[PDB]
Design a protein around this ligand. Structure first.
Ligand SMILES: Nc1nc2c(ncn2[C@@H]2O[C@H](COP(=O)(O)OP(=O)(O)NP(=O)(O)O)[C@@H](O)[C@H]2O)c(=O)[nH]1
Ligand SMILES: Nc1nc2c(ncn2[C@@H]2O[C@H](COP(=O)(O)OP(=O)(O)NP(=O)(O)O)[C@@H](O)[C@H]2O)c(=O)[nH]1
Ligand SMILES: Nc1nc2c(ncn2[C@@H]2O[C@H](COP(=O)(O)OP(=O)(O)NP(=O)(O)O)[C@@H](O)[C@H]2O)c(=O)[nH]1
Ligand SMILES: Nc1nc2c(ncn2[C@@H]2O[C@H](COP(=O)(O)OP(=O)(O)NP(=O)(O)O)[C@@H](O)[C@H]2O)c(=O)[nH]1
Ligand SMILES: Nc1nc2c(ncn2[C@@H]2O[C@H](COP(=O)(O)OP(=O)(O)NP(=O)(O)O)[C@@H](O)[C@H]2O)c(=O)[nH]1
Ligand SMILES: Nc1nc2c(ncn2[C@@H]2O[C@H](COP(=O)(O)OP(=O)(O)NP(=O)(O)O)[C@@H](O)[C@H]2O)c(=O)[nH]1
Ligand SMILES: COc1cc(-c2cccc3c2OCCO3)ccc1Nc1cccc(CN(C)C)c1
Ligand SMILES: COc1cc(-c2cccc3c2OCCO3)ccc1Nc1cccc(CN(C)C)c1
Ligand SMILES: COc1cc(-c2cccc3c2OCCO3)ccc1Nc1cccc(CN(C)C)c1
Ligand SMILES: COc1cc(-c2cccc3c2OCCO3)ccc1Nc1cccc(CN(C)C)c1
Ligand SMILES: [Mg+2]
Ligand SMILES: [Mg+2]
Ligand SMILES: [Mg+2]
Ligand SMILES: [Mg+2]
Ligand SMILES: [Mg+2]
Ligand SMILES: [Mg+2]
Lengths: 165, 168, 167, 168, 172, 172
């Protein structure tokens, strides 16, 4: 018996202020949050259709500065801001922490370069694509403000989870 | 901030063979199950719109006969099911209602009375009797058939409305 | 890469006047057709969600070598009789045989449908129809195009049978 | 030019107690109302897809015994009788006449609805009702607000009749 | 008894040529109107789900400059919520916002009317109104501010959905 | 009797690398394709609601450069509407639009074919084709013009939905 639609547990990680909450809230509520209210832990849920399969996204929005939610997640959005080189260098640390806690090389993951609407770009697309090619994962540019790439990022993660299953 | 649609935990209880599973599967899959496969415990989930609110129904299908006390404490609302061709199942209703009230330590638990198999000609429980039982408990009564689908949506949607009323 | 929803080809067969068209029109338009207008061939399409998969049902409504054509094309068959017509129930065996010959296979996705279950003049017992279906290895469903009982179930069950046969 | 989905104003008329409200509430809420609470005037709204066109149904549920206002506003009328009440069937002629006078027209979109077709106490034969409907040039549908039989069909058929009357 | 989904009456106001119609048509039809066809009065309707509640938006698209003022006072009395739109490349339209807000407050005889400030045409390069200025104006009124572009669709849903949330808050 | 939703056959044409596949994939999967995988012929399908009518879009994604093919002329005769795509940073692709339009008119033997002009890659800073120029070209052909970006998703839905509206107009 089918017992209800497929459920995917997604976790959004990355440095303080890169736009993890803004991305998530733009997905769930179609709203851009302008304030910076630091997060402890928040949970969201949304039903969507991706490639003709109905599914339920459970989304965990994490704090910038834990082992529990890394063990629960099936897929991770690894977010940096394209105007903050430090947040991009930190990506390697988030990826390592996820791999240790799940004890696995092959974890579904997507690299997300957020704030692509800002004119102060310090991380080149080619650099981020290279980093992603080296990890074997997709890369997507987003803006929580304009909504560019937001759906794509979360839907691409879902496709990665499907492939890994 | 809204964090996702409202979730309702529904538990279907009643005697062996009244059609608890058949009702639930007819709601989830639009399928009538003809076989009688006795249930231990099964969990289902469905998104629906009731009175303009989108919600997620988590539905626990229970066995006819401490794991029991667990799900009674978790559930927010109960479908109490009997079969209209089985007078025993109708008399047992009062026992299920009492067990739920003891475990939740409450008089006012959201509940709906469901008289299933209303498509069968061998009726032994009168509608008026069942309506009286329900009036005495202060809860709605609905006749259903998992076979024809009559009243199935109504039963589960009415339960959700009862849960909403109890939360104001 | 996903390029659009999955499509399923369903064929409704059975004797004249059992309610093949009435069933189909009740599925597509939520309308009971009271008139009996005999069919040559009609095609319908509907999008639905079954078990969380969005799909497109292409439905061929048949008449009571153009016949061999649609048997080769269909992935699944609703075999319909009327519960008040014993002849239509005996004819089921003939439709099933013709389908198995044309597809050269024992295991073709199929559902047995006993229609007009709202009428009081029942001449085919449920148990008999269930036995026939158990012998063929296929599901049996009672329907009424008039009350709508079992209509969705019949078509959706057929789609599930097609899915099982494709794994 | 498109400003939002097409809107249809439907009016449900007929004698007291034939099930005008029960039909409407079964359409809107998937709920059978067992109590008889007489209506003054109630308004309902539902978005549906009929023949691939999205539309908004505005539905006016009327009182058995009261009017000219809502007959002028309506684009289509469900004329309801109960199949176990011969009087309600004879009254149909009066509702149809009143509608034709107020709209000053022979060709008003209309559907004849024989409700309570789940009851065994039938006093109006289907053939009689079909003849009445054939004489008026309108469809006839048997419904039960209890089992839900024919409910969607009645309202959707009325919408199709309104569409047909507008292409000229 | 529930009788059908909740209905919200939204009114889009602001100076001539700010993009009131373009915003509305982008919401209803997913179409950018490039032509500038001045509006008299137009009505639109759309069903949407916001925060899990299904609702029906009735949307009144108004004229920049009103011919006669009684027809203006009519729709201000009917509306439950107002999108107050200026164009970020037209400082005059931004200064006019204050006047639309005042007229609405007088006609509804209330300080706390559901309202959203909308800075439209944020895709254009000739920006003359700074974001910070508009945010300050909105903070002073106690209402949300959203940047939109009817062309790119940025912020369009957000503007209308945020207005509905403001109406809900005012009704509790 | 209604037998199922209306079906529209749409063909996407234009020079190599303008973003015909990227547009189509962004419509179907909400995904931006960054890689450039040249197309021979690909078929897509999507159900949408446009102006309250549910429809099924059958979409044929064509090759940039193809010598004469009879198999190519086949599907151009079957197609009911054409998206004519150029890239706003490639003046050659804009000049080629005239050639696609001529080929379509010859194969359909008709002046009045439903068609939409699409200027893609409007997110790039290397613009060489002005909006006004493209609007003038489109006004001369009697067809709509839409700026799109498969990357940002701007105008994507609008392009395909506008084509469907053009097909509807041509059928009345
Ligand atoms: N322009 C622009 N600003 C953005 C974008 N995403 C987030 N912001 C802004 O960046 C700031 C921080 O966003 P926030 O969502 O709180 O980031 P965070 O990763 O969740 N922070 P934390 O780890 O403390 O929870 C906010 O002021 C927000 O409005 C974007 O894509 N574009
Ligand atoms: N005619 C008819 N038969 C029904 C209906 N509902 C259930 N049945 C039949 O009655 C039997 C029991 O159904 P089932 O759901 O297994 O009962 P249950 O309450 O789940 N039993 P248990 O407690 O063992 O899990 C099955 O044979 C089923 O087909 C109905 O509404 N009408
Ligand atoms: N009472 C009742 N009548 C039905 C039912 N199904 C079909 N009918 C009636 O039976 C007649 C035959 O229905 P129809 O669908 O035309 O049968 P068919 O199998 O398509 N005939 P054919 O093979 O000629 O195309 C119609 O008058 C219809 O109203 C049902 O489930 N209940
Ligand atoms: N068995 C059966 N009972 C029905 C049906 N429809 C309505 N009833 C019952 O008949 C009674 C009257 O129903 P109601 O909807 O109030 O009729 P009404 O035409 O609206 N009355 P009024 O004109 O005063 O507003 C109620 O007790 C209702 O439960 C039906 O289709 N089947
Ligand atoms: N680039 C760009 N142009 C826009 C935007 N919004 C509107 N326009 C353009 O600005 C012009 C005015 O738009 P319109 O919606 O008619 O404005 P209005 O506020 O309704 N005018 P009126 O008050 O007379 O009815 C049109 O040419 C339109 O295309 C936008 O967000 N970006
Ligand atoms: N920046 C930007 N790049 C785009 C856009 N659309 C397409 N591209 C890029 O342009 C390249 C070509 O895209 P594609 O859709 O394959 O072009 P095509 O017209 O289908 N090519 P062909 O005719 O050979 O099949 C890709 O690398 C793609 O990422 C856009 O709107 N913006
Ligand atoms: C919070 O989770 C539930 C909670 C309930 C629920 C409802 C009511 C009472 C309960 C419940 O669960 C714990 C004990 O008490 C029911 C279902 C679920 N969940 C669910 C969703 C989809 C599929 C499945 C099937 N599993 C077994 C593979 C399950
Ligand atoms: C692949 O085509 C079909 C195939 C089938 C189909 C199903 C099963 C077997 C078949 C079939 O086709 C011919 C013979 O073999 C049924 C429907 C269709 N298609 C269809 C699509 C939209 C609208 C309509 C209605 N027409 C009359 C405009 C039809
Ligand atoms: C209740 O009526 C409305 C009310 C309002 C409305 C909203 C807000 C304020 C108002 C309003 O009406 C008049 C003055 O004040 C807006 C729309 C409508 N209705 C509407 C819906 C879809 C399409 C059309 C256009 N037709 C006639 C072609 C109309
Ligand atoms: C007849 O259907 C089409 C028609 C067209 C179409 C559109 C435009 C022009 C055409 C067309 O086809 C015939 C020649 O001219 C395009 C797509 C389709 N259909 C479609 C789309 C996606 C997937 C499938 C199943 N297979 C291919 C995996 C089918
Ligand atoms: Mg945060
Ligand atoms: Mg069970
Ligand atoms: Mg037929
Ligand atoms: Mg009433
Ligand atoms: Mg305007
Ligand atoms: Mg390509």
């Amino acid at each position: 018996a089918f017992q209800g639609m497929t459920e995917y547990k997604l976790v959004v990680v990355g440095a303080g202020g890169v736009g993890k909450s803004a991305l998530t809230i733009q997905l769930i509520q179609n709203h851009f949050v302008d304030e910076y209210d630091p997060t402890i832990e928040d949970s969201y849920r949304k039903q969507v259709v991706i490639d003709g399969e109905t599914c339920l996204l459970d989304i965990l929005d994490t704090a910038g500065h834990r082992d529990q939610y890394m063990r629960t997640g099936e897929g991770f959005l690894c977010v940096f801001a394209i105007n903050n080189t430090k947040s991009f260098e930190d990506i390697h640390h988030y990826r390592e922490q996820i791999k240790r806690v799940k004890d696995s090389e092959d974890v579904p993951m997507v690299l997300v370069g957020n704030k692509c609407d800002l004119p102060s770009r310090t991380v080149d697309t080619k650099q981020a694509q290279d980093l992603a090619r080296s990890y074997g994962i997709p890369f997507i540019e987003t803006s929580a403000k304009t909504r560019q790439g937001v759906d794509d990022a979360f839907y691409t993660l879902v496709r990665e989870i499907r492939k890994h299953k």
